[PDB]
Structures are given as C-alpha cells and as structure tokens.
C-alpha cells in the first residue's frame, strides 16, 4: 500500500541508526500527548504501535529517555524512534505491539457476569509486580498503573507493562505533580495533593488492580477527584490523623467482606498490604511478588488452563533482585 521508510534509532543501546519501513498505518487513540498509530514493519510483518509527539528541538523528551533505558520481558520494548516534520518537528516512538490488554480480557469476563479465575489473577499480577521491580530500581515510577495500559497475551499468559507517558524518576530533592495516575488507581496521598510522593504510589495502583480483578469492577470508582478520596473511607474508614501526616468520620468496613464469598485468605491479606493509607506500610513490588498468594507458581506442577507452561517469572536479574537480594532465596525455588 503507502509505503513510508524513515531512518530509525533502535532504542536499545548504541546510538546507529539503520533504514526501515512499514506500511499498513491505521490511527489509533488520542490524547494531549499526540496520536498513535499502528502498522506493520516490512522487513518481517511484525505490527508495531507508533506514538508521534510534537518535540521542541531544545529540550529532551522523558519518555524516550526512560524507554532507551528499559529491557525487561514484562515491559513493552521501544524498537525504534525516529523524527519527521510548518518549521515543526516531531519524536515518533516505534514500539512493540499486543493485541489484547488485562482490561479487555477482564471485562470478557464482566460481562458474562463471570470470574477470571484466580490463576490468571496470580500469574497477571505477578508479572506487574515484577516490572514494577525493575523500574523502581532505577528510581522510575511509571505514574499510571491501570488494567488499560497493562498488555497482554492471553495464550503465552505474558503480560507486558507500556505507556510511560506519566513516567518520571523520581529524586528525593524535587516536588512532583500530585493529579496524576487514573482516577479510580489514584493513592489517596495524591488527593491529599502530596508533592513528595515516592514510587510507593504505582503499589496501591497494582493494589488497586488486584482488588478489581478479584471483584469484576473496579474497588474505587469516584465521580471527582475529591469523592475518590470518600469511595476510599467507604472501604478502609477514614485516616487517622497520624497516617493524614504521613501522606501529607467512618469506621472501617473489614476486607473479607468486600469481597466475593469464596475468595482467597492469601489474596484478600495482599490486597491489605498493598492499599495501606500510610506509603511506608505497603509492600514493595518484591515482597508482593514474594507474597504467599502467588505460590502456586513456584510450585514446579503448575500449568496454564490451556496446556502450556508459564512464562518465565524466575529469571531474575541482579538489578531486579537491588532492593533487597535475600529474597531470591524466596522468589527463586528449587528448579
Ligand atoms: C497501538 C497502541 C496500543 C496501546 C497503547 C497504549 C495503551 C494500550 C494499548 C494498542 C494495543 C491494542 C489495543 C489495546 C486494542 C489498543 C491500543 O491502544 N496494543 C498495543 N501494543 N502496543 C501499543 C498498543
């Protein structure tokens, strides 16, 4: 068809940009940022997402700069980026594209007023837990955590974090926009206006997954910004003075009932560790992937519904491993 060939940077490592082209451009979403595409590369037939985004030639843009420093299999791959042009001149990311996400294959389920069963609970949550792993250690919180922005291959079981849109690393000396994340995945720190939040946001966004992927809805669907705050002491009361000084009248409705009857113990407990008013007290994305909850992946019998095994969730690297290497002991069984 029309046929477009640019001169692409790959995006990862040495920075020797190679000729390439693609063709089948069909639009895509919207938004503030720009728009993107998706098409189809020539030279194997691969589909690839490509977000354009209008760049001021002088400053650099945040996410290019996260992406190049990404390489992880539970994080979208940033193949190549490359620029194309009034005298105006736009950043064009060429990225890895899958064609379904953990929305869409939730609300297959939703419908049928239906469970996802607890297994893909485990092994979807698992992996985000481990991508959020590896981008906090490189002090980046991905700042919009939501079953929308999560993709993932329903045969292979592999779920891949992307849209680093929001991304920012975050430093201990500069305040940060407080409107941030997705409504319903917003820590309520956040509405509270905090500047100084720490990458222990993205947690009670995953918490905040988890809950809805268990309950068929999501847990914290607000009108505003402000009633977000009261859908949250709906469920875990209001905070006491001492946790509002943390993240800078109602009693609280206990977990186990929020739930559907038959609901795991380990899950709920988890679900309670990861929405903690208080930053400090939730889990790390390591200790949650060490949780009990997702034993039943390191169990060396464990299958996939459909036949196959799982994908790899114990090739853990030294940077994965940073925050806290006793762990691996845990993470890491037998086999
Ligand atoms: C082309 C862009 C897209 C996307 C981008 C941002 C979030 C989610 C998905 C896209 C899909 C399939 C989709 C969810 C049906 C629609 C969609 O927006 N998958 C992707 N893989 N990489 C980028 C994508």
């Not at 993932?152 to 779920?159: E, G, H, Y």
Request: glycine share 4%; hydrophobic share 35%.
């Amino acid at each position: 068809s029309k046929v477009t060939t640019v001169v692409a940077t790959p995006g990862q490592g040495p920075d020797r940009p190679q000729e390439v082209s693609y063709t089948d451009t069909k639009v895509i979403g919207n938004g503030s940022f720009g728009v993107v595409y998706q098409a189809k590369l020539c030279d194997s037939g691969e589909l690839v997402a490509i977000k354009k985004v209008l760049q001021d030639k002088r400053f650099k843009n945040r996410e290019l700069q996260i992406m190049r420093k990404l390489d992880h299999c539970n994080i979208v791959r940033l193949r190549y980026f490359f620029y194309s042009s009034k005298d105006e001149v736009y950043l064009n990311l060429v990225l890895e594209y899958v064609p379904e996400t953990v929305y869409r294959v939730a609300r297959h389920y939703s419908r049928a007023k239906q469970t996802l069963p607890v297994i893909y609970v485990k092994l979807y949550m698992y992996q985000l837990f481990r991508s959020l792993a590896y981008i906090h250690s490189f002090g980046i919180c991905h700042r919009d955590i939501k079953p929308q922005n999560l993709l993932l291959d329903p045969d292979t079981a592999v779920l891949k974090l992307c849209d680093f849109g929001s991304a920012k690393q975050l430093v201990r000396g500069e305040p940060n926009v407080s409107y941030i994340c997705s409504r319903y995945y917003r820590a309520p720190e956040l509405i509270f206006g905090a500047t100084d939040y720490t990458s222990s946001i993205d947690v009670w966004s995953a918490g905040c997954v988890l809950a809805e992927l268990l309950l068929g809805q999501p847990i914290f669907p607000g009108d505003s910004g402000v009633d977000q705050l009261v859908e949250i002491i709906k469920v875990l009361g209001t905070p006491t003075r001492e946790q509002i000084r943390e993240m800078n009248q109602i009693k609280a409705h206990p977990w186990t009932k929020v739930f559907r009857p038959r609901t795991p113990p380990e899950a709920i407990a988890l679900c309670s560790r990861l929405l903690e008013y208080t930053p400090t007290a939730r889990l790390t994305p390591l200790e949650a992937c060490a949780h009990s909850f997702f034993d039943e992946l390191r169990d060396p019998n464990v299958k996939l519904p459909n036949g196959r095994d799982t994908p790899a969730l114990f090739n853990f690297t030294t940077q994965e491993l940073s925050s806290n290497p006793p762990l691996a002991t845990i993470l890491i069984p037998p086999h």
